[PDB]
Ligand binder design. Structure first.
Ligand SMILES: *[C@@H]1O[C@H](CO)[C@@H](O)[C@H](O)[C@H]1NC(C)=O
Ligand SMILES: *[C@@H]1O[C@H](CO)[C@@H](O)[C@H](O)[C@H]1NC(C)=O
Ligand SMILES: *[C@@H]1O[C@H](CO)[C@@H](O)[C@H](O)[C@H]1NC(C)=O
Ligand SMILES: *[C@@H]1O[C@H](CO)[C@@H](O)[C@H](O)[C@H]1NC(C)=O
Lengths: 48, 35, 49, 97
């Protein structure tokens, strides 16, 4: 990982700071408020 | 709290010389000049 | 650390930061030199004997 | 995605006490950090993931290839969790415990 950050194949002695270079692409969730507030669609669509 | 919200990639690295070793440095300086 | 500061955890933001590239390497390396100079400052000020 | 809030993070149970009307939550840096679950009305805290980087202690590549790794300030009873070492390759987990 510190070979990748320096972009060199030989690294001298000392302390370095590496990048992340690691990944774990996760899933997603979407929570939005409870749906209740129904419509009078049944009234217009269903009748006699 | 002081450094809580500022972990958006910013960090405050601690000094390499701690406060007690600097105290011994100053103690040596003061113990050499008085003798 | 740029990948954290300039934008939070996000794949495409880092992907497009790759195009800019070396500014970050120059910016991180700019601050480090400062930190090492601070340590050297304290070392040379206090450690005479 | 809560109530039109877009972001990335890890959600955990929180401790702050809101008001009956207040919903969001903002920190000093003016970013969302606490969000109330729309359906069941508790409070969840948002924390960053993916610890950005570590510091490797290595000698010259002339001598050898064994290295040490320093974690910045983290108490290491949870570095297997903080690093998320479970998903790492087995080579990394040598330096994880
Ligand atoms: C490895 O050793 C050679 C000869 O001793 C030297 O020229 C070179 O700089 C060294 N490389 C390091 C220490 O990374
Ligand atoms: C949504 O449904 C759950 C389960 O029936 C219920 O407990 C909750 O109260 C509903 N949402 C609202 C806003 O009432
Ligand atoms: C209308 O009536 C039909 C048959 O009775 C039923 O299947 C349907 O669910 C009702 N509502 C709508 C909106 O069509
Ligand atoms: C790290 O956590 C353990 C477990 O709570 C605790 O015993 C230890 O003192 C902690 N270390 C520091 C430096 O606080």
């Amino acid at each position: 990982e510190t070979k990748c950050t320096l972009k060199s194949f030989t690294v001298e002695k000392g302390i370095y700071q590496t990048s992340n270079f690691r990944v774990q692409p996760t899933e997603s969730i979407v929570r939005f408020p409870n749906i209740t507030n129904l419509c009078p669609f049944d009234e217009v669509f269903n009748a006699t | 709290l002081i450094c809580a919200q500022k972990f958006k990639g910013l960090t405050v690295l601690p000094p390499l010389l701690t406060d007690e070793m600097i105290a011994q440095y100053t103690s040596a300086l003061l113990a050499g000049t008085i003798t | 650390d740029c990948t954290m500061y300039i934008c939070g955890d996000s794949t495409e933001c880092s992907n497009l930061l790759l195009q800019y590239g070396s500014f970050c390497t120059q910016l991180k390396r700019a601050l480090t030199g400062i930190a090492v100079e601070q340590d050297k400052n304290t070392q040379e000020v206090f450690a005479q004997v | 995605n809560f109530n039109g809030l877009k972001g990335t993070g890890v959600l955990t149970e929180s401790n702050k006490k809101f008001l009956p009307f207040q919903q969001f939550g903002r920190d000093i840096a003016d970013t969302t950090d606490a969000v109330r679950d729309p359906q069941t009305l508790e409070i969840l805290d948002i924390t960053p993931c993916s610890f950005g980087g570590v510091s490797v202690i290595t000698p010259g590549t002339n001598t050898s290839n064994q290295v040490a790794v320093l974690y910045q300030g983290v108490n290491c009873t949870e570095v297997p969790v903080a690093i998320h070492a479970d998903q790492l390759t087995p080579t990394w987990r040598v330096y994880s415990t």
